[PDB]
Amino acid sequence: VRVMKIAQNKKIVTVYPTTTIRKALMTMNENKYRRLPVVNAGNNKVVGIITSMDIVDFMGGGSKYNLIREKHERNFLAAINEPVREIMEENVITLKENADIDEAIETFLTKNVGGAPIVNDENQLISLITERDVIRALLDKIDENEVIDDYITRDVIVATPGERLKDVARTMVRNGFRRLPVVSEGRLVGIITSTDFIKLLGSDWAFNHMQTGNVREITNVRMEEIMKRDVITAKEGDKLKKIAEIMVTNDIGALPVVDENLRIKGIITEKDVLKYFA
Ligand X SMILES: Nc1ncnc2c1ncn2[C@@H]1O[C@H](COP(=O)(O)OP(=O)(O)O)[C@@H](O)[C@H]1O
Look up residue 61 and give its DSSP letter.
I
Of 4 and 158, nearer to ligand AMP (C-beta) is 158
- List binders of ligand AMP among 166-205 (CB under 6 A): 178-179, 191, 193-196
Q: Which does 137 bind (CB under 5 to 8 A by kind): ligand AMP, ligand X, none?
A: none
Site string for ligand AMP, 234-273 (x = CB under 6 A): ------------------xxxx------------------
**How crowded is residue 124: how many other Cβ atoms within 10 Å of its Cβ?**
16
Of 70 and 90, nearer to ligand AMP (C-beta) is 70
If we measure between CA atoms, which residue out of 114, 115, 116, 136 comes closest to residue 269?
114
Site string for ligand AMP, 65-104 (x = CB under 6 A): -xx--xx--------------xx-----------------
Look up residue 64 and give its DSSP letter.
G
Task: Please give the radius of gyration of the chain, using alpha carbons only, rounded to the nearest integer.
Answer: 19
Antiparallel, parallel or unpaired: β 95-96 and 46-51: unpaired
Coil, strand, or helix at residue 147?
strand
Q: Which does 170 bind (CB under 5 to 8 A by kind): ligand AMP, ligand X, none?
A: none
Q: Which does 255 bind (CB under 5 to 8 A by kind): ligand AMP, ligand X, none?
A: ligand AMP
Chain centroid to CA 152: 19
Report the alpha-carbon distance of residue 174 to residue 19 in Å, rounded: 26
Interface pick for ligand AMP out of 4, 232, 239, 245 (rule CB under 6 A): 232
Q: What is the contact surface with ligand X in residues (CB under 6 A)?
A: 8, 10, 12-13, 33-36, 49-54, 89, 92-93, 113-116, 128, 130, 132-133, 153, 156-157, 176-180, 251, 253-254, 267, 269-272
What's the burial of 14, exposed, middle or buried (CB within 10 Å: 0-12/13-18/19+)? buried
